[PDB]
Design a protein around this nucleic acid. Structure first.
Ligand SMILES: Nc1ccn([C@@H]2O[C@H](COP(=O)(O)OP(=O)(O)OP(=O)(O)O)[C@@H](O)[C@H]2O)c(=O)n1
Ligand SMILES: [Mg+2]
Ligand SMILES: [Mg+2]
Ligand SMILES: [Mg+2]
Lengths: 218, 418, 1004
DNA sequence: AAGGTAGGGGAGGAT
DNA sequence: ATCCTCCCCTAC
């Protein structure tokens, strides 16, 4: 758990050792662009842009990658809602609970589950939109996406068209599944069963599965 | 939704047990595999285009040396001389050791399903074929026992062995003496090869056979009658001892020749040939020895007789007569025989009546020209004589005039029978 | 009140509507909104028993339903095909409904709309106003399309508006990346409904020094800071990036009829939209005519899969999600589907499309003057070149030298262009507009005003090439012609293949003939044999060959045999000769030839010996009428082609009649396609069986024919091999040729539907006269019913290599001996896209030399073999050591896709690694270049162990390294085999390989 | 949403 | 050797 200094707010980044190989580039890339983004209000607050770098990688097996760290009613990391009110987190709990048999629960958060590291491609967006800063982060996102992938066996991305060419973005091969975001129109996420497929493929290839029901709050 | 979970769960269910799947279940499996792959771009399991039915998991090498038996309860069943078949529920019967198509009657297929509807714990039924008589030998089940299955089989028309139950209360050294005692305790009149016993709690069958290796001199080969133009070969040694033969192929594959010594296993009751080690020489020698008028039809021999109306009535199950007109009068009265005549073509009806094998008979037909008038045969000749190199084809042609006589007669029966 | 239909499109909201865009005689644009329904076809007893009442229902007549499943029988007791007749209803429901016994569920809802209301997609109408309610400014709603569009009027012409656009993006070393690289230039060609054409380019002033910006203004440029002060009549405007993108927004949101780009659906529009979103809060918004839906510009990817056992993906396209009636049209996808090139880059397409032969008018120290007109080339090529010259910058000479244009003068009919080039000692050269020799990366490194102005000139040219290609391929004409015949909206004409485009005319036929085709069984695919191909009898002929070809043989076979799923009487099979003869003796009496046709096919199952398919020709079926429809259209466009004058008109009409050729033949493919609704195994196999007999009949009667004093003798009696007729079958026929002629005919080759008949003559003028008279006698006496042939050409100096490989000099059937022949190649290495240019140049030289010296004939000892081989070895060794040839001569082309079995295929690996390590991404429908490259230190070897390990994918920026060389071992071996395979020697040819490559050849 | 066979040449492999 | 399989593209 080291840290580096940068030229703009939050002026410091704290990271787990497993992220050392990219920190040498993150400081340069962020210092050249922060002067533009940090003039206005952002969601999340800039103080949490790099909060996801505290997560260890050597003890992970699956990475679930979203599009952005949910600006509206966000916490700084993807797939969290402090009051379990967001459509995305509720629909994830609904699908898993129906398969598992969970009836009485008060919340859900993928950051609780062991073995999985929540992630999002774009490090920020505007409030009310998605993929609004793709021109801003793309180069940084590619660095972090290939780095996190090298530490997991199965990469689960949301967005049939968003991660269509992810195989070209990644350096090392990874078991790649691209599913529906759990908030899409026409109820297309309701038929998505990627979570179960992930554990089955891990078992077949003798890897530790993800305890997806671990993320429920009781 | 539930539609996708159904497809995935059915795929997992079939995957875990693909060794009890027929063509329909396999097609469903492979369809679900293709569905999963195209839908998710990656699938855990792949298509299957193999796994034949086998029962080898339930048996082992036959023990022919003395050994000790410590456990108590056993059931002993005989294993008869003859070919072994396996029957599956709702399916046809297959000959064990080679996947083929063997003639099976309707009575046995019905009786098999009737006992297999009793419970769903039975994997297969084991049958033995001895001189065109069927005996059921085994029915391995995870829930039933080899007692009530046989009792029901008997009520449905099938033959069953004499059930014996034995409990061992000591440390016994199994030897030929006890083999003979328990073999004769069955009080069965059919030749047997071995005895198979099972321990309560296991599905595995163990088999014992005490025999001596020897050589014997063959004096002659002859065929015995067991049915209507059906003859079975046997081998007679210089001493007059009859050596049992499973079928025609048995002697050909064992390279048996007359007036020479062959390898044979000697048992306390009879001598048996075994298959473990040209064909043109051996089959010709057998035919010449048993008689020039015999030819091979599948697993047996038949004669080249001048069968006419009297034998047609026996195959049609109608009154025996020499009047052609009666071949329609009675048929219109008995509904159980008209169905055969109208359902089958004239070619097959007259082919059956003279006991011609399908494969060789058609080969003759397709190498010879026919002249027909009003769909009745008036002349024929051979255009390709190479088909005559097989002794069966030349012999069949020698008596083809009898085929034409019956063929033409049945044609006119069909024209008036409708 | 009087409108011409331009487009149809739908909304994507909760309430789906179908919109028509049309324009009135005076130029005004009107939209009409139609309710959208789901259409179901049910029988009377189903209709009256539907528990949920339908929204609306009308009777659609009394129709016959035919079960078209096929079964084999072993005797002649064939029962009647199951058919029912009943009153039926057509019901429409705004929402999807599940109906247990609905039929005709394989047609589009838009097809039901067009057909039920009698509306053609591109018709011109005079509308009844009482059925139109005004809902917005220029928008009406129509509840009763059946009576509103009842009146149709003759076609009239209307103005249309176009926007052609291109951009140029900054980069330093590699392909541009949106996250770093600014936009440099944006160019438009703006054409209004008045016909006024405006050309302008915008320059990003942020990359210039303030002193340079003032210099630009002084030179005549305009400088603007906002959007309200923009003027589109100025050729150069300098502004910041924010203005550049806001102008792009303003133009793209206008209601153009067409917005036309080249590969702009993946790059141009994507870059503009993505960069705008970050810099400011504006987005590009499309709105429906009635303002009930609004969508942001988003690019969606459509993936096209194959239909093989491991289908995979074989192509991909990108589409704009606009809902305002504008057609966003991408030349890249259009051309890629239509034409065949080594590559589909803009420079490659232009190089081939825009060219002419020019004469050298004057010469100079560094400049040559080229003059072109209709007197030096085919009519219209000099005019097309002159048109493009207006904006072009470089002209390529003989497809190799890139020359700068110094002066241009556009003449009344032709052009005069002055190029900066070395003196070329000849009088005639080929000019085309191809690749530029500029280096954009260096131009950005030194970016300044003079460069900015030159780049503006380049950018407006690229935008104008989109307009020049738009007209060149006749896209407007093809679009309307397709929509009318396929009953498809104009926006969907070039997106579907046979399975869907034939549904329009098919539905019309089924409703007109009162037929529905249904199935009750499971389809199973069986193989069958195809057409006949003959083996060439001789390698070199040294004689004129007369080629006669059946005119659309397939459609005539189905009409002749009345082949369709519902006309099959049955399939009779046998297992033995005795039953076969009995069935034949009854067959000739149960189904007399005068009404029935019997086709003797190859066995279907391995346990059968004979199969006969019986077809009833007394009532014409559905497929023959579908085939007649396509035949009528093709003939009409062929007739118009004969009346075309300019090269542009000829190309457009030739392309359209070819398209109808393909769709007519694909009707068979659908009949043989296991997943088709028209699948018929018996019919497809019977068609090819009749075809084989038809070719053998014509080939047999010509092989051995002799032309005598005044009579032609055919080799065989002219007996109809299908049925007995009343034709005079005597093989002696009267001709109109002079007594001087005495010739014998021999058949030397034949392929699928043509016969190659050799005549013992050297002249062409005699060959043409005889061939024309010979066709007359064949069509009148040899052939029957609707089977006709045409004389194609005389092939002079024809050389055969295999059953699919030959070369010759073509003399057209209307060209006399004084004409210039066309050199044509079929199946040879000179036409392939996967060999090289090094191979092609040499094989042409050696094959020509071989033909000339072998045709004359010397053969003192072994002259022909040794002369060719000795020169070949010298050139191959010289090239290896010299290594002077450009890499562009050793490049191969290959298609990328995912249609593979096992996942470790080297082809997928090679591309995947390229995509990961390069900003350039190869997509699943694109073609890329590759070469065999090995380290420069590797000597010439003889034992080749690995080949695929030398493949590398090369981009435009690829430069062969100083530590690399071309892997000549693989390039030379392939060329050597092609040359040696033309020689008749063995002993010396084997030695050649043993010393040069260390291997023994195979002599075929 | 998806047309059909005949055929040649080349690269790698399992003998 | 020595044939077999797979693929790519072309002619119909
Ligand atoms: N794409 C194609 C083209 C060829 N063939 C078949 O090949 C036969 C003859 O080839 P071709 O001459 O190219 O087609 P035709 O119909 O004969 O064209 P044409 O008008 O020149 O006679 C046709 O009946 C058909 C096919 O099935 N599919
Ligand atoms: Mg033709
Ligand atoms: Mg033609
Ligand atoms: Mg042709």
């Amino acid at each position: 758990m080291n840290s580096v200094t940068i030229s703009h707010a939050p002026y410091t980044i704290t990271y787990h050792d497993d992220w050392e190989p990219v920190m040498s580039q993150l400081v340069e890339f962020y210092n050249e662009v922060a002067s533009w983004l940090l003039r206005d209000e952002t969601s999340p607050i800039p103080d949490k842009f790099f909060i996801q770098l505290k997560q260890p990688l050597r003890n992970k097996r699956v990475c679930v990658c979203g599009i952005d760290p949910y600006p509206k009613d966000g916490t700084g990391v993807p797939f969290e809602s402090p009051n379990f009110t967001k459509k995305s987190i509720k629909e994830i709990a609904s699908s898993i609970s129906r398969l598992t048999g969970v009836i009485d629960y008060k919340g859900y958060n993928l950051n609780i589950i062991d073995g999985v590291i929540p992630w999002n491609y774009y490090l920020s967006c505007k409030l009310g939109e998605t993929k609004s800063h793709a021109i801003y982060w793309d180069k940084i996102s590619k660095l972090l996406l290939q780095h996190i992938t090298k530490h997991v066996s199965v990469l689960y991305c949301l967005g049939k068209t968003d991660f269509s060419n992810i195989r070209a973005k990644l350096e090392s091969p990874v078991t790649t599944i691209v599913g529906y975001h759990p908030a899409a129109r026409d109820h297309q996420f309701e038929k998505d069963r990627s979570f179960e497929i992930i554990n089955v493929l891990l078992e077949l290839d003798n890897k530790t599965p993800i305890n997806w029901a671990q993320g429920f709050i009781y | 939704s539930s539609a996708d979970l159904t497809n995935l769960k059915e795929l997992l269910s079939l995957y875990k047990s693909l060794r009890f799947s027929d063509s329909v279940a396999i097609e469903k499996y492979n369809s679900l595999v293709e569905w999963g792959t195209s839908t998710y771009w990656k699938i855990g399991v792949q298509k299957v285009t193999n796994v034949e039915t086998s029962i080898s998991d339930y048996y082992d090498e036959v023990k022919n040396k003395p050994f000790n038996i410590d456990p108590g309860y056993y059931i002993f069943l005989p294993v008869y001389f003859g070919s072994v078949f396996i029957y599956s529920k709702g399916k046809n019967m297959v000959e064990l050791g080679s996947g083929n198509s063997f003639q099976i009657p309707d009575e046995i297929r019905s009786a098999c399903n009737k006992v297999l509807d009793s419970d769903n714990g039975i994997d297969f039924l084991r049958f033995v074929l001895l001189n065109n008589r069927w005996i059921m030998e085994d029915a391995i089940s995870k829930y039933q026992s080899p007692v009530n299955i046989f009792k029901l089989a008997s009520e449905y028309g099938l033959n069953i062995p004499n059930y014996l139950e034995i409990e061992i209360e000591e440390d016994t050294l199994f030897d030929d003496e006890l083999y003979s005692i328990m073999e004769r305790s069955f009080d069965d009149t059919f030749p047997k090869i071995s005895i198979s016993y099972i321990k309560l709690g296991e599905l595995k069958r163990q088999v014992v056979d005490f025999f001596k290796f020897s050589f014997m001199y063959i004096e002659s080969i002859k065929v015995d009658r067991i049915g209507d133009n059906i003859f079975i070969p046997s081998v007679i040694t210089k001493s007059g001892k009859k050596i049992l033969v499973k079928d025609v192929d048995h002697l050909i594959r064992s390279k048996v020749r007359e007036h020479t010594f062959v390898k044979v296993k000697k048992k306390n009751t009879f001598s048996i040939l075994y298959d473990y080690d040209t064909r043109g020489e051996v089959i010709k020698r057998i035919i010449d020895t048993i008689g020039r008028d015999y030819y091979v039809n599948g697993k047996y021999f038949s004669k080249v007789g001048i069968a006419g109306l009297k034998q047609l009535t026996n195959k049609l199950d109608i009154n025996e007569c020499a009047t052609v007109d009666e071949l329609v009068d009675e048929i219109n009265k008995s509904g159980t025989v008209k169905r055969k005549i109208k359902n089958q073509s004239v070619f097959d009806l007259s082919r059956e009546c003279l006991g011609y094998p399908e494969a060789d008979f058609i080969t003759l037909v397709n190498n010879m020209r026919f002249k027909i008038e009003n769909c009745k045969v008036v002349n024929f000749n051979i255009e390709n004589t190479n088909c005559l190199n097989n002794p069966s084809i030349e012999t069949i042609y020698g008596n083809f005039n009898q085929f034409v006589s019956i063929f033409n007669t049945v044609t006119d029966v069909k024209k008036r029978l409708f | 009140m009087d409108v011409r239909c331009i487009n149809w499109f739908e909304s994507h909201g909760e309430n789906r509507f179908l919109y028509l865009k049309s324009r009135c005689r005076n130029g005004e644009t009107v939209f009409i909104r139609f309710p959208h329904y789901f259409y179901y076809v049910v029988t009377d007893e189903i209709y009256q028993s539907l528990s949920p009442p339908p929204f609306n229902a009308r009777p659609m007549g009394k129709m016959r339903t035919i079960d078209i499943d096929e079964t084999i029988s072993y005797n002649l007791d064939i029962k009647d095909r199951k058919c029912s007749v009943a009153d039926m209803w057509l019901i429409e429901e705004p929402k999807k409904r599940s109906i247990q016994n609905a039929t005709m569920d394989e047609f589009f809802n838009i097809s039901w709309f067009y057909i039920s209301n009698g509306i053609s997609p591109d018709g011109c109408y005079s509308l009844d106003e009482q059925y139109l309610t005004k809902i917005n400014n220029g928008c009406y709603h129509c509840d009763d399309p059946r009576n509103c569009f009842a009146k149709e009027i003759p076609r009239f012409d209307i103005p249309r508006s176009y926007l052609f656009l291109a951009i140029a993006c900054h980069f330093d070393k590699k392909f541009p990346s949106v996250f770093i690289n600014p936009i440099s230039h944006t160019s438009y060609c703006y054409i209004d409904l008045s016909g006024k054409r405006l050309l302008f380019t915008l320059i990003n002033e942020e990359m210039l020094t303030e002193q340079e910006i003032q210099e630009a203004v002084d030179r005549g440029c305009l400088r603007i800071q906002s959007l309200m002060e923009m003027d589109y009549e100025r050729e150069l405007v300098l502004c910041s990036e924010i203005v550049l993108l806001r102008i792009a927004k303003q133009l793209l949101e206008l209601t153009f009829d067409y917005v036309v780009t080249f590969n702009g659906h993946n790059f141009d529009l994507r870059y503009i939209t993505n960069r705008l979103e970050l810099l400011t809060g504006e987005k590009i918004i499309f709105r429906s005519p009635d303002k009930k839906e609004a969508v942001h510009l988003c690019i969606y990817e459509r993936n096209q899969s194959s239909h093989k056992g491991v289908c995979g993906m074989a192509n991909t396209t990108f589409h704009v999600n606009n809902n305002n009636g504008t057609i966003f049209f991408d030349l890249y996808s259009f051309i890629q589907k239509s034409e065949k090139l080594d590559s589909y880059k803009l420079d490659s397409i232009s190089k081939n499309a825009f060219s002419c032969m020019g004469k050298v008018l004057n010469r100079g120290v560094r400049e040559m003057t080229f003059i072109g007109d209709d007197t030096t080339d085919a009519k219209g090529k000099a005019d097309t070149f002159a048109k493009v010259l207006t904006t072009g910058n470089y002209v390529t000479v003989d497809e190799d030298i890139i020359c700068k244009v110094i002066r241009k003068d556009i003449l009344e009919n032709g052009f005069k262009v002055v190029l900066s080039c070395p003196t070329l000692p000849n009088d005639i050269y080929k000019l085309s507009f191809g690749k530029d020799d500029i280096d954009l990366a260096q131009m950005y490194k030194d970016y300044n005003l003079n460069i900015a102005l030159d780049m503006a000139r380049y950018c407006i040219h690229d935008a104008c090439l989109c307009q020049y290609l738009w007209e060149y391929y006749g896209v407007e004409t093809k679009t309307d012609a397709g929509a009318a015949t396929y009953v498809l909206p104009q926006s969907m004409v070039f997106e579907y293949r046979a399975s869907t485009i034939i549904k329009g005319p098919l539905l019309k036929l089924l409703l007109e003939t009162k037929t529905i085709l249904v199935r009750s069984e499971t389809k199973q695919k069986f193989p069958y044999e195809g057409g006949k191909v003959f083996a060439p009898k001789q390698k070199m002929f040294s004689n004129n060959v007369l080629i006669f070809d059946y005119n659309s043989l397939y459609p005539n076979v189905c009409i002749f045999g009345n082949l369709s799923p519902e006309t099959l009487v049955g399939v009779v099979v046998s297992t033995n000769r005795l039953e076969e003869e009995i069935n034949n003796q009854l067959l000739l009496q149960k189904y007399p030839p005068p009404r029935y046709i019997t086709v003797h096919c190859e066995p279907r199952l391995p346990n059968l010996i004979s199969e006969i398919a019986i077809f009833d020709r007394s009532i014409e079926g559905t497929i023959p009428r579908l085939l007649r429809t396509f035949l009528a259209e093709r003939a009409r466009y062929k007739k118009m082609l004969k009346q075309a004058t300019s090269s542009t008109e000829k190309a457009i009409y030739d392309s359209m009649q070819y398209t109808y050729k393909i769709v007519a033949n694909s009707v068979y493919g659908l009949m043989g396609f296991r997943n088709s609704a028209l699948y018929s195994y018996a019919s497809a196999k019977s068609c090819t069986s009749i075809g084989r007999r038809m070719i053998l009949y014509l080939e047999s009667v010509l092989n051995g024919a002799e032309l005598s004093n005044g009579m032609l003798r055919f080799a065989n009696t002219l007996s109809n091999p299908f049925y007995m007729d009343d034709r005079d079958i005597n093989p002696i026929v009267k001709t109109s040729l002079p007594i001087d002629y005495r010739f014998r005919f021999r058949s030397v080759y034949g392929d699928t539907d043509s016969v190659f008949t050799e005549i013992d003559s050297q002249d062409v003028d005699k060959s043409i006269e005889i061939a024309k008279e010979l066709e007359r006698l064949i069509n009148s006496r040899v052939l029957f019913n609707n089977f006709k042939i045409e004389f194609e050409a005389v092939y002079k100096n024809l050389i055969m290599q295999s059953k699919k490989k030959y070369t010759t000099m073509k003399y057209s059937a209307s060209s006399n001996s004084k004409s210039v022949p066309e050199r044509i190649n079929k199946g040879t290495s000179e036409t392939r896209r996967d060999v090289s240019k090094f191979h092609k140049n040499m094989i042409k030289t050696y094959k020509t030399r071989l033909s000339e010296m072998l045709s004359e004939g010397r053969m003192n000892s072994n002259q022909v073999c040794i002369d060719i081989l000795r020169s070949l070895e010298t050139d191959l060794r010289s090239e290896f050591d010299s290594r002077s040839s450009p890499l562009e001569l050793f490049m191969l082309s290959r298609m990328h896709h995912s249609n593979y079995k096992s996942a470790d295929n080297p082809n997928m690996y090679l591309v995947t690694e390229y995509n990961k390590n390069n900003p350039e991404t190869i997509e699943l429908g694109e073609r890329y270049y590759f070469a065999y490259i090995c380290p420069a230190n590797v000597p010439w070897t003889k034992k080749l162990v690995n080949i695929k390990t030398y493949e590398t994918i090369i981009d435009r920026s690829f430069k062969l390294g100083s530590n690399q060389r071309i892997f000549y071992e693989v390039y030379f071996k392939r060329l050597t085999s092609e040359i040696v395979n033309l020689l008749d020697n063995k002993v010396l040819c084997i030695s050649f390989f043993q010393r040069m490559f260390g291997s023994r050849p195979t002599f075929y």
